[PDB]
Amino acid sequence: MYGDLGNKLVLEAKRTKQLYARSNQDVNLPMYHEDIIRNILKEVSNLRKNTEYLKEQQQLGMLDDKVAKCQYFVTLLCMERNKRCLLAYQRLRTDILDSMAWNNNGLDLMDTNNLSHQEQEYLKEYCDLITDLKSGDLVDIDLSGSLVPPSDVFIDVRVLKDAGEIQTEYGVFNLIKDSQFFVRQSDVERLIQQGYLQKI
Amino acid sequence: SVLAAANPIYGRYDDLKSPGDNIDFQTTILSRFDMIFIVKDDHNEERDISIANHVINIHTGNANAMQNQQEENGSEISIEKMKRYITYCRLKCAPRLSPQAAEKLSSNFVTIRKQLLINELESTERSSIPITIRQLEAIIRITESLAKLELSPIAQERHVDEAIRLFQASTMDAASQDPSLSEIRRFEQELKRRLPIGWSTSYQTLRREFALDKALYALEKHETIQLRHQGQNIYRSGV
Amino acid sequence: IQNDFDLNTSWIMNDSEFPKINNSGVYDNVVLDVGVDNLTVNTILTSALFVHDAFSNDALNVLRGMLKEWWDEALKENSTADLLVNSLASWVQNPNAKLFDGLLRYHVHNLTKKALLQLVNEFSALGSTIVYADRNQILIKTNKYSPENCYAYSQYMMKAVRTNPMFSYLDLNIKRYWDLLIWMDKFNFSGLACDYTAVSQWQLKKFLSPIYQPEFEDWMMIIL
Amino acid sequence: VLPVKIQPPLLRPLAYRVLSRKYGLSIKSDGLSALAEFVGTNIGANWRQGPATIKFLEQFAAVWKQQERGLFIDQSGVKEVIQEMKEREKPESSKALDWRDYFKVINASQQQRFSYNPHKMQFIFVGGIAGFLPDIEDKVQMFLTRYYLTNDRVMRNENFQNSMSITPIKNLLGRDAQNFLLLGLLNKNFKGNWSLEDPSGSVEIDISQTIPTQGHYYVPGCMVLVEGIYYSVGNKFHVTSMTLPPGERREITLETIGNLDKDLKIRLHLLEKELTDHKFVILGANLFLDDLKIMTALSKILQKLNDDPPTLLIWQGSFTSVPVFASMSSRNISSSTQFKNNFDALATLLSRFDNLTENTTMIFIPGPNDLWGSMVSLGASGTLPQDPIPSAFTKKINKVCKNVVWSSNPTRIAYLSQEIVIFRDDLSGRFKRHRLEFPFQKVQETRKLVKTILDQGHLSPFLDSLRPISWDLDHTLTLCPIPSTMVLCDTTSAQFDLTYNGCKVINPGSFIHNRRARYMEYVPSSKKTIQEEIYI
C-alpha cells in the first residue's frame, strides 16, 4: 500500500539487530540508507500535498464529511505508520551508536562514512556528554570501566602490540613484544581494552 | 552443475578453419552451457619460462613447501575449509538482483545480441556460439553466485560488472573467433600505394575514400599500419 | 591554431628516433668503414625520384628547385652556394628559423630514413653485408677475404653506388679497412685496420674493477 | 609564571591519575618528560597545573582523537592550540591572532586528493624521485571523476529545480523512439560524427534540428545535457534541445562536504570583519621581461605601489616575449641564461623600492612562455597543471625579498574562509576556435564563457587531446566547491569583472592593452574590485 518502504527499512533494521546481536564482533553500523529515507520522505511529502489538495478541494467543492474525513484520516494514519517505521530505524541506530560509544570511550574513537551527518554530530556530542558525566561528580569511580567483577587483582599478561615504553602510575612498563608481565589488573585495564595485553 | 572438458577438432583449435568447423557440438548443446572458455597455447617465451619455473618448483619438492607456506599466510586455504565454506554459503544465502542491476543486465544483453547479429551479418553465417535468453539467465545466476559468495542478500552492480567481464572473457571470446577478400586486397593495395610508408593520415580520410573495414585490423595484425590517436589516426608503421 | 595542443603536431615534434643497423659478431672478411656526407642534401635533391601528416608538396617542390639551383651553382664557382646548402642541412631542424615547420622537418627526417634504407638495400645487392649504419657511417662486410683484393673491389663498389641516380649527389669515402674486426656497438669494438694498425675502443672495460681491467685488455689482445 | 624544572618521576602519579585514569590517555616516558618541562616552565612548584593538563587532554580528545599523546607533536600541537585559544580569548601567550596563520597558497601538488565514491561519498586519498608520476588508472579516472561530480551537481540542482530524469546511454538500446535526456560528454567519434560519451556507453547524435542554450559556449570535450528522441533504425539520438548542466552555489558544496571547526570558523569570520583594509594587486598578462618599454612601465608601477605596498602582488604567466626552448648557438641567446638574466634584471629593478616587497607576498604564475612548461610546448597550450617556476632562475629575485612564492598556474589560496583560485590562460581563443556551430556583445561573450566554465565545473572542460592534463592532478582544475574569487587571467579576452552563482570572476587582461600598463586591485573585505590603467 504505502508502508512498503517503511516495512523494508524496519526489516533491514532487524537484520542489523541480529547482525550485531551475534557475539560481540563490534562491527561498525551498516551504511546509512539515505536512499530509503529519501524515498519515504518523498512519499510523505506527496501524501501531505494530497492532504492539502483534499482540504482545499473540499473547501471550494461540495464534499460531505464522510469522504473528506475518511481519506484524510487514512492518509494521516499512513504518515503515523511511516513515521513510526522511521523512528524505529533511527532509534535502533542511535542505541547501537550508544553501545559503540560506551564500550569504546576507553578503546577508540572511530569508518564514520556509514553514519549521516546528524548521527556523526550526535556521536561527537555524546562522547562529550559521557566525559562530562564521568568528570562531574562521580569522578572518583571510573564510569567507563569494566562491567565484569574484579575477581582477581594480580594477573599475568603478554604484549600483543609493542608500544615501546609507557609510564604507569608509579613505575613504568616496557611493552616489549612477546614479553610477559605479572602485575596488577587494576592499572592495565585500559591497555588490555585498547588491545595491547592479551592474557586474561 | 556441469563442468565439461572437450577438445576442438584436429587436436589444436585450428583457427584458420571456421569456428564451426573446429567444434562438432551442435548449437542446441552449446545453448545450455553457460560459460564456454577457449584456452589457447600462446607459445609466449616469457610465459613459457614462467610456466616452466612453476612446474620445476612443482616437481622438485618445492611445491609441498611453498603451497603450505602460502596457505599458512592466509591467501590460500585448504580443500576442507573451502568445502565447508561453500556448503555454508550455499545453504545460507540466495541473493536476488537490484532493479539497477536488472537494467544494466538488460542493456548488456541487448548489446551482446546486437554484437552477435552484426557478426553473423558480416560472416553471412549463423555463429556456432548461441547467445539467447538462457545466456541472460546465466549472467543472472553468475551475479547471484557473486553476491552469494559474499553472503550479500542483494546483488550489487559490482557483481554485474564482474559477471559481464567474465562473460566477455569466455563466451564472447568464443563468439569473437574468426577464420569480401577482393575488397580487403583492394583497400590494402590502395592504402599501400597512397598512404606513404613513413607518414600517417586520419581514419576519416579512409572513410571518405571508401564497410566494417576489417582490412585495417588485419593490416594492424600484419604491423604495417597502427591506430594511435584513439583510432583517429592510422600511421604506416613501416611495412 | 598553432597555440593549442595537437596530437599529430606534438608527436612530430618529439619524433627523432633514427633507426640504427648494428650486427654484433666477429667477421674475418675485409670490412670497409665508409663515411657518408651530404646525406640530407642528396635526399632533398633526389626526393623527386588525404595524408594529413604529409608536408606541403608545393613548398616541397619550391625547396627542391631552390636546392637544385644552389647545387648547380655549387658545381661552378660559388662558395655562397655550398655554404647555403650546408646551412639548409643544419637549418631545417632549427626552431629559431623564421620559416621553421615541424611537418617539414618530420618529412625530411622520413625521407632521409628511406634514402638510407635504399642505400642499405643497394649495398646488400652489391654483395657486401652491413654490420653498422647510423646515417653518418656505414660498415660493409665485403666477401673479399684478401686484404690485397680490396682496393679495386672498393673502387668498383663505390663507382656502382655513384651510378645510382638517387645517390649521385651523395659523397662517400673509405675511412678504414678491417681485415679483422670484433664488433658489438659504436663504442665497444676492436680489430685490425689498414691489416697492420690495431684499435681497441671498449667502454665496458671501464665497468670492470681496476685489478681486472688490465687483465681484460691483455687477454683481449691475446684472443685477438 | 615562575620558571622551574620538575622531574618526570614526581609528576608521574598525578599525570597518570589525570590523563590515563580520567579519560584514557597513554603516556610515554619522552612525552612525560617534555610535559614536565613545559609545566615547570609555565608554573612554579608544579601544583596548579591540573587545569593545564585537563585543557591539554580535552583539546587532544576533541581534535586529535587517538591515544599515546606523548609523541612530541600531539603534545606540541595541543600546547599551541591552547595558545591560540587563550590569545583569542583576550600562561604562555596572550597575544593577538594573525592572518598569516590563516593565509596560505596551495600548489597543484599540495592539494587534497578528493576522489568521489560513485554511490555516495567524496573520499580523501592524500616515495621516490619518480613518485609524482600519474598512473594509468589516474588517466582512466581523470574524466570519470569529472563525470561523477557533474552528475552529482545535476542530480542535486536540476531535479530540484526542473522532474524527468537522466537515462543511461546503455539503457537506450531497446527503446525505439522514446524521449530521453542525457548528461554526456560531447565529442566527435573516430568516424568523424558527433556523439556523447558516458560510463554507460556512447551514443551518436543527429546534431541537426537542435536548439541549444544561447548563453553558453559549446565545444568538443565539454559535457552537456541533451534531450531528444532515440532511433534504433539508425541507432542515433536525434537531439532537439541541449544545455549545460546548471551550476551550484559554494555554500551548497560546503554543506555537502561538511568541511570547515566552529572555533576556527568564528576566528576566520572575526579576522574577515576586522581586516577591512587589505589590498590585493594583480598584474596583467604577458609581463615580458625582454621588452624595454615593459620595464619602463613596470618601474613606474613598482614606484607607484611602493607608496602603499599591498597585501599580495601576484605575477602572471608568460614572463618573456619568446617561448623558451633548447636554443642552439654559441652566443648568449641561450634562453635559459637569458631568462635567468631577465629575473636578475627584475631583481635589480625591484630591489630599488624597499617599502614595496616588504610586508607583502608576491606570487608568480607560470604561463605559455615559462621554463619547464614552455621549453617543450614552445608557447603552445601544454600541460595545464603547470609546475612552479624553477628556483634555478630565482636566486636573485628571492634573495632580494623575504616573501616570494612561485605557485602553480591553476593555484589555490586559502587567505580566509574564502578560497581564491588563480588561473592564467587564454581560454577565449580556444573556445572561439573550437566552438562547434549549430544547424538549428563582448560582455555577452564573457558571460557565455564564464557560464560555461562554472556550469561545466572544470577549469578547462576540454578533451585531453586538446589540452593535456596531469592525470593525478585533475582535482586541482575541478571547480567542485565553486570558490568565490576567480583570478581568470587571459590575454585574448577584454578586461572585466563579473559575479554569478556567488562566485566572482576577474579578467585583468594583458598587461599592455594599447598604451597603458593595466593592473587590477581587489579588496576582499568589501569584495570590491577596481581597474588601474597607467599610461606609459
Side-chain angles (χ1 to χ4, degrees), chain A residues 1-30 32-51 53-61 63-200, chain B residues 1-180 182-184 186 188-213 215-239, chain C residues 1-16 18-41 43-66 68-147 149-156 158-224, chain D residues 1-21 23-62 64-68 70-118 122 124 126-261 263-273 275-490 492-536:
Chain A
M1 187 66 204
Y2 277 117
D4 306 351
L5 279 170
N7 193 359
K8 277 193 179 83
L9 178 59
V10 299
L11 261 187
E12 191 269 357
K14 75 95 175 180
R15 199 271 310 160
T16 68
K17 192 184 48 67
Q18 291 98 23
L19 160 69
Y20 203 72
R22 303 287 88 86
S23 65
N24 194 28
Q25 84 268 18
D26 295 332
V27 69
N28 195 328
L29 277 75
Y32 194 91
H33 295 280
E34 185 55 272
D35 53 354
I36 311 170
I37 300 301
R38 290 189 337 265
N39 295 351
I40 190 160
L41 279 171
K42 181 260 288 182
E43 201 167 18
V44 160
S45 297
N46 297 353
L47 291 156
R48 181 171 43 174
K49 291 196 277 196
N50 176 276
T51 58
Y53 177 76
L54 189 150
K55 285 314 283 207
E56 54 91 19
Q57 189 254 315
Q58 194 274 341
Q59 301 302 318
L60 58 91
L63 293 172
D64 53 353
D65 184 74
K66 175 63 69 182
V67 59
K69 156 167 75 79
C70 283
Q71 289 203 66
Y72 187 51
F73 192 72
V74 159
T75 305
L76 211 63
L77 290 201
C78 277
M79 283 74 75
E80 290 184 356
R81 155 84 192 203
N82 299 125
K83 177 196 75 171
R84 175 185 180 190
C85 297
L86 295 168
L87 279 175
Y89 176 73
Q90 182 55 255
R91 174 56 165 295
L92 186 152
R93 286 186 86 90
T94 291
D95 300 354
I96 291 190
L97 184 144
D98 292 320
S99 295
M100 202 295 278
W102 267 120
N103 301 16
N104 296 21
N105 206 19
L107 193 144
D108 195 76
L109 283 154
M110 65 182 179
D111 292 332
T112 80
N113 71 325
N114 298 273
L115 321 174
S116 86
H117 310 132
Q118 310 88 17
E119 290 177 357
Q120 292 193 353
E121 182 179 1
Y122 172 66
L123 172 57
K124 262 63 160 180
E125 65 82 32
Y126 186 54
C127 297
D128 305 325
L129 161 61
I130 286 173
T131 50
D132 191 4
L133 299 156
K134 302 159 38 192
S135 73
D137 195 7
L138 311 183
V139 59
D140 307 321
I141 63 170
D142 190 289
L143 206 61
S144 178
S146 81
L147 282 191
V148 295
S151 66
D152 45 357
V153 55
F154 277 101
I155 57 162
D156 45 358
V157 288
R158 211 161 284 155
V159 180
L160 286 187
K161 293 199 220 152
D162 197 307
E165 189 174 16
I166 283 176
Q167 298 273 11
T168 186
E169 193 170 327
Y170 276 52
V172 67
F173 289 172
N174 195 359
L175 282 76
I176 295 151
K177 201 185 174 171
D178 265 340
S179 69
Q180 179 147 348
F181 295 168
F182 164 68
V183 286
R184 255 179 283 101
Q185 193 259 329
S186 303
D187 55 357
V188 301
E189 182 42 64
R190 50 183 195 80
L191 295 175
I192 298 181
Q193 196 195 2
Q194 288 171 12
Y196 289 71
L197 311 182
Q198 57 93 214
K199 183 158 300 311
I200 209 66
Chain B
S1 303
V2 172
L3 167 59
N7 218 328
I9 297 169
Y10 297 99
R12 301 292 186 184
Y13 177 64
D14 194 0
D15 54 354
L16 270 298
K17 299 264 179 169
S18 74
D21 200 356
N22 317 311
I23 310 152
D24 62 357
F25 295 96
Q26 275 310 312
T27 314
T28 75
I29 185 65
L30 286 192
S31 65
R32 284 87 169 94
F33 267 95
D34 291 331
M35 294 298 102
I36 302 159
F37 273 89
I38 292 182
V39 299
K40 279 160 155 202
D41 268 330
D42 271 315
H43 279 254
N44 189 2
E45 183 178 1
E46 52 88 18
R47 168 149 191 279
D48 292 338
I49 290 280
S50 313
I51 301 195
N53 298 338
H54 166 87
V55 166
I56 290 163
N57 303 355
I58 291 296
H59 268 61
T60 69
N62 287 20
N64 299 61
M66 293 182 286
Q67 276 162 50
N68 276 46
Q69 179 57 256
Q70 184 67 221
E71 200 280 300
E72 295 277 2
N73 174 48
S75 178
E76 283 184 27
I77 300 193
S78 63
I79 298 169
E80 313 93 19
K81 195 166 168 120
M82 294 298 102
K83 185 179 316 195
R84 297 300 301 280
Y85 175 70
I86 279 164
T87 311
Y88 181 75
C89 275
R90 291 179 61 122
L91 271 69
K92 263 303 178 193
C93 200
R96 88 165 212 174
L97 303 161
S98 73
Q100 312 85 50
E103 294 134 23
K104 259 192 75 73
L105 284 190
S106 160
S107 68
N108 176 233
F109 184 59
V110 176
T111 307
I112 292 293
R113 293 274 274 193
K114 181 51 179 160
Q115 271 181 12
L116 192 80
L117 172 59
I118 69 183
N119 287 14
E120 280 189 358
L121 277 194
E122 174 268 350
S123 178
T124 74
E125 166 56 80
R126 313 285 280 284
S127 67
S128 46
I129 295 91
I131 300 293
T132 55
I133 297 92
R134 207 184 268 131
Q135 272 68 22
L136 161 69
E137 310 186 346
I139 307 170
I140 292 163
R141 288 191 276 275
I142 293 163
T143 311
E144 293 175 351
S145 63
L146 289 179
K148 207 189 288 210
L149 59 90
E150 297 159 18
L151 282 163
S152 162
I154 184 168
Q156 304 320 113
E157 315 157 47
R158 315 165 296 109
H159 314 129
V160 161
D161 283 315
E162 179 77 2
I164 288 171
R165 175 199 87 80
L166 265 187
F167 187 81
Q168 275 152 5
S170 58
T171 310
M172 294 298 102
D173 176 35
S176 67
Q177 307 283 60
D178 199 70
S180 187
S182 64
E183 281 290 288
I184 295 154
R186 192 273 307 277
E188 289 192 27
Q189 291 306 110
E190 69 88 20
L191 63 91
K192 280 176 167 192
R193 303 169 301 110
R194 282 290 293 163
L195 160 73
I197 182 72
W199 284 260
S200 66
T201 189
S202 66
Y203 172 65
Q204 207 169 354
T205 54
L206 198 46
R207 293 214 318 109
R208 292 192 296 272
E209 198 273 329
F210 188 70
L212 202 48
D213 311 313
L216 65 95
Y217 174 58
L219 293 168
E220 187 275 332
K221 276 179 168 175
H222 293 292
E223 280 298 271
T224 187
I225 72 167
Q226 169 204 116
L227 290 89
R228 45 186 187 179
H229 295 335
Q230 272 156 317
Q232 294 175 354
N233 184 211
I234 298 167
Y235 159 70
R236 194 92 174 280
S237 66
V239 172
Chain C
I1 207 69
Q2 88 272 33
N3 283 355
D4 50 39
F5 176 79
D6 172 51
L7 291 174
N8 211 359
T9 291
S10 170
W11 184 87
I12 68 174
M13 295 298 102
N14 49 24
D15 185 49
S16 55
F18 206 101
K20 279 191 194 290
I21 298 100
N22 177 89
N23 304 84
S24 48
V26 185
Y27 313 105
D28 54 355
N29 298 115
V30 165
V31 305
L32 320 176
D33 198 310
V34 191
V36 300
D37 206 350
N38 295 337
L39 176 56
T40 60
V41 188
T43 302
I44 71 179
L45 285 162
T46 65
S47 65
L49 318 179
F50 183 35
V51 189
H52 294 349
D53 216 350
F55 195 63
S56 167
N57 195 1
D58 300 332
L60 193 67
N61 301 319
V62 174
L63 282 171
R64 175 181 294 107
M66 187 66 203
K68 255 76 176 179
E69 62 178 355
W70 275 5
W71 163 259
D72 59 358
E73 283 155 35
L75 296 174
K76 63 179 177 64
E77 200 277 334
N78 197 356
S79 71
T80 63
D82 76 359
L83 189 59
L84 283 173
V85 309
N86 294 134
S87 59
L88 188 149
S90 84
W91 158 89
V92 163
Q93 67 179 359
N94 180 19
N96 293 276
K98 282 161 176 52
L99 279 169
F100 160 76
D101 194 305
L103 275 156
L104 175 60
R105 186 196 48 180
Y106 169 66
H107 203 106
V108 164
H109 174 265
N110 306 303
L111 289 192
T112 294
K113 263 175 48 187
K114 310 304 178 293
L116 183 63
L117 169 72
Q118 294 307 320
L119 180 54
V120 164
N121 288 333
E122 153 72 21
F123 267 121
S124 71
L126 187 152
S128 298
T129 66
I130 318 298
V131 299
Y132 193 53
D134 66 334
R135 188 256 303 281
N136 277 316
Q137 80 187 0
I138 179 160
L139 270 61
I140 55 173
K141 181 199 105 188
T142 66
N143 289 334
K144 301 292 264 193
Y145 284 76
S146 170
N149 291 124
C150 82
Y151 305 102
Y153 189 88
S154 71
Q155 299 332 108
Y156 182 76
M158 61 79 71
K159 290 309 184 190
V161 173
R162 292 298 313 264
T163 51
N164 289 114
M166 72 291 291
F167 306 132
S168 298
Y169 318 112
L170 189 61
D171 50 304
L172 304 94
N173 49 337
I174 304 156
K175 300 148 91 148
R176 269 182 312 285
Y177 313 85
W178 310 94
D179 189 5
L180 193 52
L181 185 78
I182 320 164
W183 180 267
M184 293 180 183
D185 286 322
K186 181 50 199 84
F187 309 100
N188 293 298
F189 74 100
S190 196
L192 278 297
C194 189
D195 66 275
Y196 52 100
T197 60
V199 302
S200 166
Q201 183 185 140
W202 291 109
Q203 201 263 342
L204 302 171
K205 176 192 51 165
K206 313 298 153 191
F207 276 83
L208 286 172
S209 62
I211 189 167
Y212 295 139
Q213 298 188 30
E215 264 288 290
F216 166 82
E217 197 62 34
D218 176 71
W219 278 111
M220 183 278 288
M221 283 74 75
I222 282 161
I223 299 166
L224 182 60
Chain D
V1 303
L2 166 65
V4 73
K5 184 65 178 69
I6 61 170
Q7 65 183 177
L10 265 294
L11 187 60
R12 158 169 56 234
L14 284 83
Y16 172 99
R17 286 200 212 77
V18 176
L19 309 176
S20 62
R21 285 179 167 177
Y23 287 77
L25 264 58
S26 307
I27 46 172
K28 292 181 181 180
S29 195
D30 61 318
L32 170 66
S33 311
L35 261 188
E37 175 266 332
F38 178 74
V39 166
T41 48
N42 271 314
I43 197 168
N46 65 271
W47 300 134
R48 297 308 100 74
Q49 77 278 9
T53 52
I54 282 168
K55 275 171 55 68
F56 177 93
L57 61 84
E58 70 181 2
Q59 205 281 320
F60 181 85
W64 271 248
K65 312 188 173 184
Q66 73 269 16
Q67 290 77 14
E68 272 88 8
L71 291 174
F72 288 172
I73 192 66
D74 300 351
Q75 176 193 318
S76 296
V78 180
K79 287 199 304 289
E80 300 312 318
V81 168
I82 285 153
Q83 290 326 301
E84 291 90 6
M85 61 79 71
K86 291 188 289 181
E87 285 177 352
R88 57 91 182 170
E89 189 271 329
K90 302 296 188 292
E92 191 176 35
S93 49
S94 57
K95 308 178 288 290
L97 304 181
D98 188 14
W99 57 279
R100 300 278 182 90
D101 314 309
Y102 308 101
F103 158 75
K104 78 210 292 199
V105 60
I106 307 291
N107 278 344
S109 70
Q110 296 154 349
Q111 312 215 15
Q112 289 291 311
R113 281 77 170 176
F114 263 95
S115 55
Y116 182 90
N117 187 3
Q122 195 157 355
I124 192 66
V126 174
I129 306 106
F132 74 109
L133 280 182
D135 296 333
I136 308 312
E137 193 276 333
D138 306 308
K139 178 161 194 164
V140 171
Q141 58 81 31
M142 65 179 288
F143 283 109
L144 292 171
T145 302
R146 177 176 330 190
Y147 183 93
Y148 286 144
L149 296 193
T150 303
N151 190 359
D152 296 307
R153 180 154 36 74
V154 163
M155 61 79 71
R156 286 196 228 121
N157 189 359
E158 180 271 342
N159 58 343
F160 291 160
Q161 301 331 113
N162 288 93
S163 185
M164 61 80 71
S165 307
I166 285 299
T167 61
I169 294 190
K170 218 180 201 187
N171 281 9
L172 310 192
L173 288 158
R175 290 77 189 253
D176 185 25
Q178 295 177 357
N179 295 113
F180 300 97
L181 175 79
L182 322 177
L183 165 67
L185 193 143
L186 172 63
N187 52 340
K188 220 167 200 173
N189 290 318
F190 65 100
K191 319 172 66 55
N193 58 5
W194 291 109
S195 169
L196 277 72
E197 174 80 29
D198 190 281
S200 71
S202 67
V203 56
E204 299 189 331
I205 56 161
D206 185 58
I207 210 164
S208 79
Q209 318 160 37
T210 318
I211 305 309
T213 301
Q214 326 282 355
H216 295 122
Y217 281 162
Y218 295 121
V219 292
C222 69
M223 181 145 88
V224 291
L225 272 167
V226 310
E227 191 188 12
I229 62 169
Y230 172 84
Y231 280 160
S232 288
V233 287
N235 193 13
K236 285 167 93 100
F237 193 76
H238 284 65
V239 55
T240 62
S241 75
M242 183 278 288
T243 184
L244 289 180
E248 286 188 4
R249 301 260 155 169
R250 172 164 184 177
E251 65 276 20
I252 310 184
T253 316
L254 265 293
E255 58 88 15
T256 56
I257 189 63
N259 192 47
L260 308 100
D261 316 320
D263 185 76
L264 186 67
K265 181 255 175 185
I266 301 299
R267 285 175 292 165
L268 267 294
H269 194 268
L270 189 138
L271 269 67
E272 196 281 317
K273 262 67 190 164
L275 274 68
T276 316
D277 183 70
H278 265 285
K279 175 169 57 169
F280 301 159
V281 164
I282 301 298
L283 290 150
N286 305 349
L287 284 74
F288 293 167
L289 305 178
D290 287 315
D291 278 297
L292 73 164
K293 190 166 42 200
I294 287 183
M295 283 74 75
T296 57
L298 192 45
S299 162
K300 292 176 205 49
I301 300 307
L302 285 184
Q303 169 267 331
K304 285 149 208 292
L305 276 296
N306 187 68
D307 297 331
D308 177 24
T311 308
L312 318 172
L313 179 51
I314 317 295
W315 303 72
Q316 309 284 52
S318 54
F319 291 98
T320 183
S321 174
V322 298
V324 61
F325 52 91
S327 304
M328 72 291 291
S329 69
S330 80
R331 316 313 188 280
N332 201 21
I333 295 297
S334 310
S335 285
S336 165
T337 71
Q338 195 168 3
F339 204 67
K340 188 158 155 281
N341 296 336
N342 287 332
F343 286 167
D344 291 352
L346 189 47
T348 62
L349 272 297
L350 184 149
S351 81
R352 210 161 43 186
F353 297 143
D354 52 354
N355 183 19
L356 210 52
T357 78
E358 299 312 308
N359 311 119
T360 292
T361 292
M362 311 75 78
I363 292 183
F364 290 73
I365 296 315
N369 305 341
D370 283 291
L371 267 293
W372 270 251
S374 161
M375 183 278 288
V376 291
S377 70
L378 301 203
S381 297
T383 300
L384 187 51
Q386 309 211 3
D387 47 351
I389 307 297
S391 70
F393 294 78
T394 81
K395 292 172 181 175
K396 284 265 181 159
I397 288 282
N398 207 347
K399 205 213 300 166
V400 165
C401 314
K402 75 173 172 291
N403 296 114
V404 166
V405 170
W406 318 78
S407 197
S408 305
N409 201 319
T411 190
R412 264 167 188 78
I413 303 184
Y415 158 61
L416 282 182
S417 78
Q418 57 169 3
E419 287 170 4
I420 305 103
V421 166
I422 309 179
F423 185 45
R424 159 74 176 110
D425 192 5
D426 298 341
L427 291 170
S428 174
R430 283 220 297 274
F431 269 117
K432 291 202 300 193
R433 291 179 291 170
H434 299 101
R435 183 176 63 248
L436 73 164
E437 294 294 328
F438 287 90
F440 58 83
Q441 168 53 265
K442 303 298 209 160
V443 63
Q444 173 54 222
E445 289 179 351
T446 61
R447 190 183 330 281
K448 286 168 74 172
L449 186 143
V450 175
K451 282 184 50 207
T452 307
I453 283 290
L454 275 196
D455 287 323
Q456 273 293 295
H458 202 262
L459 269 172
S460 87
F462 290 112
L463 288 181
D464 192 274
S465 67
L466 196 40
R467 182 68 183 272
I469 293 158
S470 191
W471 315 325
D472 53 351
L473 308 185
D474 191 28
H475 50 63
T476 67
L477 322 174
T478 62
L479 320 178
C480 177
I482 303 92
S484 72
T485 305
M486 295 298 102
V487 188
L488 273 194
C489 197
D490 188 325
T492 180
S493 167
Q495 178 185 15
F496 74 89
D497 164 40
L498 303 176
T499 174
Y500 168 85
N501 213 8
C503 169
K504 198 71 171 176
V505 163
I506 52 174
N507 167 64
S510 178
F511 193 65
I512 307 297
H513 210 75
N514 313 133
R515 280 306 291 269
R516 304 144 194 75
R518 313 188 287 99
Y519 79 90
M520 188 66 203
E521 305 193 350
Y522 173 56
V523 180
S525 303
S526 59
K527 277 189 286 282
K528 192 201 78 70
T529 79
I530 187 64
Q531 54 83 26
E532 300 293 329
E533 293 184 5
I534 291 293
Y535 196 79
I536 181 54

